[PDB]
Amino acid sequence: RPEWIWLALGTALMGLGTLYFLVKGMGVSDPDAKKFYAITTLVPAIAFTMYLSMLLGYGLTMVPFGGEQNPIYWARYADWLFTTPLLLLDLALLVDADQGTILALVGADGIMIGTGLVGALTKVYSYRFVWWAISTAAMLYILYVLFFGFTSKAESMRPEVASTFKVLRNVTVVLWSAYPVVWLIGSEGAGIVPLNIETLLFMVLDVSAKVGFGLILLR
Amino acid sequence: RPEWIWLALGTALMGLGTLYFLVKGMGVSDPDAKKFYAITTLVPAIAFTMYLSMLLGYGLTMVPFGGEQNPIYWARYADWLFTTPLLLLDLALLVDADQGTILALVGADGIMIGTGLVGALTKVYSYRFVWWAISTAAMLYILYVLFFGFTSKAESMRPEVASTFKVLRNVTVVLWSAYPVVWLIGSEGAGIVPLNIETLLFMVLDVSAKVGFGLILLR
Amino acid sequence: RPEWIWLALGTALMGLGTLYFLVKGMGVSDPDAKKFYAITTLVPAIAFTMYLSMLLGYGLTMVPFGGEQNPIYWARYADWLFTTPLLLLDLALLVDADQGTILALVGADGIMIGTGLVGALTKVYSYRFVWWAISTAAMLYILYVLFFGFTSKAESMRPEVASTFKVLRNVTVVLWSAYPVVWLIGSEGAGIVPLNIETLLFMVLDVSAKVGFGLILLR
Ligand SMILES: *C/C=C(C)/C=C/C=C(C)/C=C/C1=C(C)CCCC1(C)C
Ligand SMILES: *C/C=C(C)/C=C/C=C(C)/C=C/C1=C(C)CCCC1(C)C
Ligand SMILES: *C/C=C(C)/C=C/C=C(C)/C=C/C1=C(C)CCCC1(C)C
């Protein structure tokens, strides 16, 4: 009930970029710029639908025993699994990396949100902190590859595509370090900050994580 | 009950192309012709399994309140999400387009059938006309890109791959304009033409949409 | 109950390769070797999570009528659909095949485990031997393409990438011929060898199928 404003405002903050970024897109100047744009207009568009999902009844599938109390949203992972892989596909093409590190990067995140989604889904004889750990170890892996493999290739004769990528790394690193700590303290972990606050918190991270990320890759 | 003949005949009309098109395929003459064939044999093959799904009990997940009355098929979107993206992958390679417009084209349809599937699934505090609209806006987008972006590239020194693509555009445009209007009048919208007729209608569009489409890309 | 040891040991036998193979990976010597490694570390990693899924309560969705007796695991197909396509992506890049035969190969397996998963899921007016057949016909197809299309390209001026691929074909062919016969005799077919034995059987095939497969592609 008290998450509605964060739900609808979340859709409103995404129902802006999909509108703004769609106008600049489709402008055939460079074939490479086309793929870069495409994605950073599809990303806030998939989450927009998803937030409108949480707004209009959707998102439910329980955590440790549902029906009795604990309310949860599955619609969230339904988009993080369909947002994180493409957002890295925009930062892997910038770094002009080989299909090798890109592949692991999809299978890495796939498992990261797969394992998290499962973690949230009921608690069938398993501890939900088990999966939270597997998904965290899955995330650190990316941070390793991000500030190690990408950096050892970040330059490309162009100071921009190398320093305007550093600002991306700052955005992303602080951004993603966030999600995990937001889990085991209320939403789907402990039970300190219930559902209400968790819903705003998660959305702040999201609007900044996509439109803000895209609001970098436009400059 | 009265959809069985349209179900089984639908499987019969697909259980023909998968058989015909499989014989001509695997003929290594051109590496490019190989990828073109592959898909237009996998498409009527995925729907064939799906139709046999609707025939043999599958397809259920409710619309506005199930269990009481309104019978629906989820197996349908389970294939449209797995047919439309590849069928455009055959018309995007013909146009020899960049990975840019191809990508948006997958994420565009993904959301088109994702949003439609959801629209059909129950009606949890949300209007099923909301998603029908989001999926329609998702479809017009493709029609824009199809008869704008593809045309402004349709030629390629080969009159065939440019005019035998125009006949594809006619097939596709009239074809897809169909689905949407078929929704809000009975099947999962209003309630004029119930389930019976809707089942034939949908299949006519399908046999023509795939085998007929493939029966173009063979000539 | 009696499958626990096979479940946990299965996770233990995969919770070894993901550890071993991760140490050798990320070693940038060749851009081509990078993609080859990536996958054969992600494969036993996805199944590892899945086995830990079967271990910790997950895997349930019934076969012919559930809730009354027949216990099943859906977590299995949840990984075979996410293991078989990538494992062939490692043997299709070795053979340096065109995007044509690779594509059919993904859509072929997709339907193979899709059709099998469905086969296992309840038995809604349909015979579970119907899908078992569709999934078998889907598998023979690959064996045709594997020991026909790949062989008629296996050489590449390098005796290794052509003979150390033959040993892969032996591993794979005997390996995959296995799964199908393991189905209609107990697990989800007849009812001779119940759940207990089926759980070991399936795991023997798995540890050998991935780590052992990977333990080839490392040499
Ligand atoms: C737009 C949304 C994006 C980019 C979401 C990204 C999400 C993450 C970095 C999530 C990470 C998680 C964990 C490390 C463990 C617990 C589960 C998650 C999903 C919160
Ligand atoms: C073989 C099946 C194919 C190519 C199916 C294509 C489907 C569409 C063009 C569907 C469009 C829809 C809408 C615009 C809104 C309502 C939901 C759909 C799925 C009927
Ligand atoms: C690591 C797991 C792998 C590589 C699994 C491969 C699985 C198969 C070859 C499965 C085949 C099946 C059939 C032919 C019919 C019945 C259903 C299956 C899934 C057992």
The residue ranges of every structural domain in chain A are: 1-219
Greatest Cα pair distance in chain C: 59
Place of tokens 């993901």: C18
What is each CA distance from B207 to A122, A123, A138, B181, in whole angstroms?
42, 44, 44, 18
Q: Round to whole Å and give the CA distance between C90 and A27.
A: 37
Contact B172, B139 (CB under 8 A): no
Ligand nearest to the CA of C202: 3
Contact A120, A78 (CB under 8 A): no
Q: Ligand 2 centre and the CA of C164: distance in Å?
A: 46
Greatest Cα pair distance in chain A: 59
Q: Nearest 5 degrees, angle CA C35-CA C36-CA C42?
A: 85
Backbone conformation region of residue C97, classed left if phi is above 0, alpha if psi is from -120 to 50, else beta:
beta
Task: Name the residue of chain C whose CA is nearest to A119's CA.
Answer: C53
CB contact under 8 A, B56 and C124: yes
Q: Using CB atoms within 10 A of its CB, is residue A173 exposed (0-12), middle (13-18) or buried (19+)?
A: middle
- Is the sign of the CA dihedral A93, A97, A100, A106 positive or negative? negative
Contact A115, A131 (CB under 8 A): yes
If one counts every other C-beta atom within 10 angstroms of the C-beta of residue A182, the result is 18
DSSP class of A219 = -
- Is the sign of the CA dihedral B13, B18, B23, B27 positive or negative? positive
Quick one: fold of B1-219? Rhopdopsin 7-helix transmembrane proteins (1.20.1070)
Q: Any CB–CB contact under 8 A between B21 and chain C? A: no
Ligand nearest to the CA of B51: 2
Question: What SS3 class is residue A188?
Answer: coil
Task: With CA atoms as reference, report the closest residue to C109 among C140, C79, C139.
Answer: C139
Nominal resolution in Å?
Answer: 2.3
Contacts of C125 in chain B (CB under 8 A): 56-57
If one counts every other C-beta atom within 10 angstroms of the C-beta of residue A72, the result is 19
**Type of residue found at B64:** P
Question: What SS3 class is residue B72?
Answer: coil
B135 ligand 2 Cβ < 6 A: yes
CB contact under 8 A, C38 and A98: no
Where is C78: in which H helix or E strand? helix C77-80
| Token pair for A75 | 């619609």
Contact B105, B145 (CB under 8 A): yes
CB contact under 8 A, A46 and B107: yes
What is each CA distance from B173 to A167, B119, B140, B166, B168, in whole angstroms?
43, 23, 10, 10, 8
A214 ligand 1 Cβ < 6 A: no
Q: Round to whole Å and give the CA distance between A97 and A150.
A: 8
**Type of residue found at A36:** F
Task: Name the residue of chain C whose CA is nearest to B34's CA.
Answer: C100
User: What Rg, from alpha-carbon coordinates, does chain A have?
Assistant: 18
Contacts with B67 (C-beta within 8 Å, 6 or more apart), sequence order: none
Provide the residue count of chain A: 219
Experimental determination technique: X-ray
| Token pair for B53 | 């799904």
Return the HEC string of chain A. CCCHHHHHHHHHHHCCHHHHHHHHCCCCCCHHHHHHHHHHHHHHHHHHHHHHHHHCCCCCCCCCCCCCCCCCCCCCHHHHCCCHHHHCCCCCCCCCCCHHHHHHHHHHHHHHHHHHHHHHCCCCCCCHHHHHHHHHHHHHHHHHHHHHHHHHHCCCCCCHHHHCCHHHHHHHHHHHHHHHHHHHHHHCCCCCCCCHHHHHHHHHHHHHHHHHHHCCCCC
C-beta pairs of A10-14 under 8 Å, 24+ apart in sequence: A10/A51, A10/A203, A10/A206, A10/A207, A11/A48, A11/A51, A11/A52, A11/A55, A13/A203, A13/A207, A13/A211, A14/A44, A14/A45, A14/A47, A14/A48, A14/A51, A14/A206, A14/A207, A14/A210, A14/A211
Burial code (b: 16+ CB inside 10 Å, e: under 16) for C36-59 equals bbbbbbbbbbbbbbbbbbbbbebb
What is each CA distance from A139 to A109, A118, A175, C180, in whole angstroms?
7, 16, 12, 36
Where is C106: in which H helix or E strand? helix C99-120
Task: With CA atoms as reference, report the closest residue to C77 among C106, C101, C53.
Answer: C53
C-beta pairs of A5-8 under 8 Å, 24+ apart in sequence: A6/A199, A6/A200, A6/A203, A7/A51, A7/A54, A7/A55, A7/A199, A7/A203, A8/A55
Q: Using CB atoms within 10 A of its CB, is residue C69 exposed (0-12), middle (13-18) or buried (19+)?
A: exposed
Q: Any CB–CB contact under 8 A between C102 and chain A? A: no
| DSSP string of B120-151, one letter each residue | HS--SSS-HHHHHHHHHHHHHHHHHIIIIIIG
Beta strands, E only, B59-121: none
Q: Using CB atoms within 10 A of its CB, is residue C114 exposed (0-12), middle (13-18) or buried (19+)?
A: buried
C116 ligand 3 Cβ < 6 A: yes
The closest residue, in CA terms, to atom 1 on ligand 1 is A206
Contacts of C58 in chain A (CB under 8 A): 118, 124, 126
| Token pair for A68 | 């009795």
CB contact under 8 A, B107 and A45: yes
Q: Any CB–CB contact under 8 A between A46 and chain B? A: yes
- Is the sign of the CA dihedral C48, C54, C57, C58 positive or negative? positive
Q: Round to whole Å and give the CA distance between B51 and B46.
A: 9
Contacts with C107 (C-beta within 8 Å, 6 or more apart), sequence order: B38, B39, B42, B45, B46, B86
CB contact under 8 A, C126 and B37: no
Place of tokens 């405002």: A9
C117 ligand 3 Cβ < 6 A: no
B76 ligand 2 Cβ < 6 A: no
Q: Round to whole Å and give the CA distance between B52 and C118.
A: 11
Task: With CA atoms as reference, report the closest residue to B73 among B88, B82, B60.
Answer: B60
Q: Round to whole Å and give the CA distance between A209 and A175.
A: 7
Contact C26, A149 (CB under 8 A): yes
